[PDB]
Nucleic acid binder design. Sequence first.
RNA 1: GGUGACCACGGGUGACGGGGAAUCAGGGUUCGAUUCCGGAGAGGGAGCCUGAGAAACGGCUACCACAUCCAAGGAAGGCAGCAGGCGCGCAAAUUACCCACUCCCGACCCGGGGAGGUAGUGACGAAAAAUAACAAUACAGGACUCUUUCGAGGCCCUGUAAUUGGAAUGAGUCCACUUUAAAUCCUUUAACGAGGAUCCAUUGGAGGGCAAGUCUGGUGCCAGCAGCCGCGGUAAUUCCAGCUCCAA
Lengths: 262, 131, 141, 58, 185
Amino acid sequence: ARGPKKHLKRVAAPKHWMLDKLTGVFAPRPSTGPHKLRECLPLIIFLRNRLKYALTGDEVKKICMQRFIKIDGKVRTDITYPAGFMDVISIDKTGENFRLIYDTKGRFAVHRITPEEAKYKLCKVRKIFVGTKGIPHLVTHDARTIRYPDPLIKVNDTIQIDLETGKITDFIKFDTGNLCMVTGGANLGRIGVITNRERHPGSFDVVHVKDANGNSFATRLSNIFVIGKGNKPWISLPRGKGIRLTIAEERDKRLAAKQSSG
Amino acid sequence: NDTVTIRTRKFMTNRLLQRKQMVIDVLHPGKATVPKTEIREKLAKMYKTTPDVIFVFGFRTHFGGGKTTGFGMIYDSLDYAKKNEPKHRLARHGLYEKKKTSRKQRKERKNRMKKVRGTAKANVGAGKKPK
Amino acid sequence: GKCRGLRTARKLRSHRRDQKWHDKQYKKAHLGTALKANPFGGASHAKGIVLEKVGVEAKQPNSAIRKCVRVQLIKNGKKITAFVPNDGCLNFIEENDEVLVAGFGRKGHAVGDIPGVRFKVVKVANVSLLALYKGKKERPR
Amino acid sequence: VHGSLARAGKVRGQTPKVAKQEKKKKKTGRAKRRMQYNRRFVNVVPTFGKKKGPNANS
Amino acid sequence: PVARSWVCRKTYVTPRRPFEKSRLDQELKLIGEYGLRNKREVWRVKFTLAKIRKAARELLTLDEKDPRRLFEGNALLRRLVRIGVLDEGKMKLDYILGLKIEDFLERRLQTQVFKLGLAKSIHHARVLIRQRHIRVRKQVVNIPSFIVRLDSQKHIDFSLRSPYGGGRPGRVKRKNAKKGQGGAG
RNA sequence: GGUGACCACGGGUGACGGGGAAUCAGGGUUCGAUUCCGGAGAGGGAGCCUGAGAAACGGCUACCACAUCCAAGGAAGGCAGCAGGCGCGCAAAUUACCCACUCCCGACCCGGGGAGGUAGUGACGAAAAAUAACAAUACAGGACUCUUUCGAGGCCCUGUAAUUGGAAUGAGUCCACUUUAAAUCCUUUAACGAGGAUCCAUUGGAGGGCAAGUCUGGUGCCAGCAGCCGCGGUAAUUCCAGCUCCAA
Ligand SMILES: [Mg+2]
Ligand SMILES: [Mg+2]
Ligand SMILES: [Mg+2]
Ligand SMILES: [Mg+2]
Ligand SMILES: [Mg+2]
Ligand SMILES: [Mg+2]
Ligand SMILES: [Mg+2]
């Protein structure tokens, strides 16, 4: 190519978007924003395929242009705005709030939250650098950067950003024994407690995490988001508490649900 | 008319487009597909509205007659219905006109206007001669 | 015997690809000289102009005059001999006809008692010889 | 050429032309399969012949 | 480019060698006994049984207690007992290898209506299904190869619009009636 | 100095690479121009402006090869985009409709999109699936039975042919609904629509391999058949035909 690509084929779209094959040839191709397009959920498919508020791209465009969709406390009119991980989607006319969290199968689930919980948001710090006039900075897992943080905050810790101010109210250190969530790879969507961290200089650190049921897994350090102080999460977890359960104990749950409903 | 019934399902309401949308099925055991106007007034009686704001489409009939299923749309007001609803459905109800030229002729005029630069009179008289 | 060491794969594959040149099928399909010598140029069918009508004597145990046509192919101008495969289909063939010729059954090898003939006529003047033989349609007068 | 092409189509020319006898149409498909299953699977013959073929020229 | 799918597969396999009396006679016997149209729709059920047996044999080659083996084995046994070719007490992968294509052919709708007695013969059953007279639950089915599950076994019945359940006699009946009343006052 | 029998270097490729496809005990062998990803090119080369991003070609400059108009002084070109022509060929579709869907672009809820969608051609190929079913008479057959072959019907299953013989349906005509941007098609649904139900199933075979005729009439080592063995020289299981059978 002679420049940047601005199209996305439907079959080349991320798998967690849950798009089909026969609707068309193209995918939303989310605009640039706080999150990479691989792990973002554009508003068009969030409001058309997840909530069914709109049936077409034109309808979701009308919904967005009437200025009802609020992301992170700010009105966004971009039809293909990359929402991303745990950004609060607020609709005030119908009065519900959504927190965008991966489910147990590594897909963004429709998670509804109370307004007083939606007022805040967790972020994972990605870098800390000092800039001119000796001013510390802090760049989170979003594109969001802030100044004058707590000097105790180190790399890949969690901070509590309250909306409408952008400031820090509390933070969780990345420490052994803290509740986390996997934000990439096979173990995507699993809630567990930091049990071990082995570090490989010149390469990626590997962290070993055990869930509530005792299933122990591991993942790279870049895929971990600390979400709780020890074991109580600071947010509301989705259904299943992020416990990945195998097909063997999924099938009988389906059978029991069918028996109860029939 | 003696045996025709509407049944609604997947009903939901949204204030984003100020409407209530659902998927409905009508049961004609031995008659043809029920006319969309008939669904319109019957659903208007069902939801205590008038058969001018009702919007239905996509009626596919199951094999062997009987059930046919379509998607129903009701709005709070006709002004909102005009505001956010596809122009082809507005034209189906007669509220929108498509009295325009062909796409081919439109492209011909657009390309002919490109040969004339700036001059407004010769830019608007470009399509007058080659009709 | 053959070598069986854990790191003899180079010798095994080299010997295999050296010995693969000694059977006729691989040599024919991968040397390219057979493709150059093939009048059709690796095509299933070809078109040509009937240069002449000839009779070919059958082989020793048989005794017949097989009816063939000497045909110059439109592409590459090569001259071949094509059998006319039915009882009276030579009468439907005249000079300067555009005939379609296919292989005569066994991949560039002569078939039956017809010596040195590897092609047969399928269509003449864009009408099938089978159709003409069955009378289902007529010559384009 | 040695000149032996003058006899092309000789036997097909000399063959007397007899017309096909007009006959009843044959069942096709499932009916044909039913008929040919019935002929050779449900029948009892009391005559010898050592299981002669279906096109016996007796 | 185009938003099609073009994902398709063949449903039958032709036999390796043609013109053998044993196979020809066996296939003709099956066709005659089950009222099948041709050899393609018995090679189809043979192919289906071959695929099922291949899956079962591969699962058997897997080790016992292997979760993939367990999960897919229960899935396959569940499907087999839903279509009814396997007894509910025979929930073992070994019994899947013992199945035959006659068990699958017996579960066709064409055979099932004949067994239930809605038709006087298997060919009458096929034509009766094709002319839209047989319904399952509430849906009318005109496919003779409709495999009938155990739960849908009881709900096979004549269609309401057909001139065997409800009214509306056929066009020939109506024409005969109107000719009769036009001949006799 | 560096690289080479652990194959350098050179040549060929009917080589774009990969995800993949065919075949299918296991191992493999072939195919991947082709809708997804990556690369390259815009007649052949070469050089540039602009711009964040181009060595851009539905941008420019020059040369080469083609080639358009000309008042002969000049001027304008790049369909390996969508259609559609010529040529090449064994070999491949309509100079159609629409931005209604999926998305893209823009100052942008409003415009544009031969991207793309829809329809047309389409036996590339894949799935389902009509061309008939039933009953009653004659003539047979059955482990049939009733007296122990004799004769029949208290039963069952075929085939032969009929004023049978009245039931069920489509394939088609075709109103409406539905579908759809608008149509079309499918599914519904009025009314016509089957007794050579002439509303007609074909393609290849009948010596063997290999299922099916030592039938009949012609031809006479001719014509021809025959993948291979072989057939044909006047009584052809093999050619040309009729009939009858076989396979799908
Ligand atoms: Mg090449
Ligand atoms: Mg490729
Ligand atoms: Mg590409
Ligand atoms: Mg380029
Ligand atoms: Mg260039
Ligand atoms: Mg026919
Ligand atoms: Mg013959």
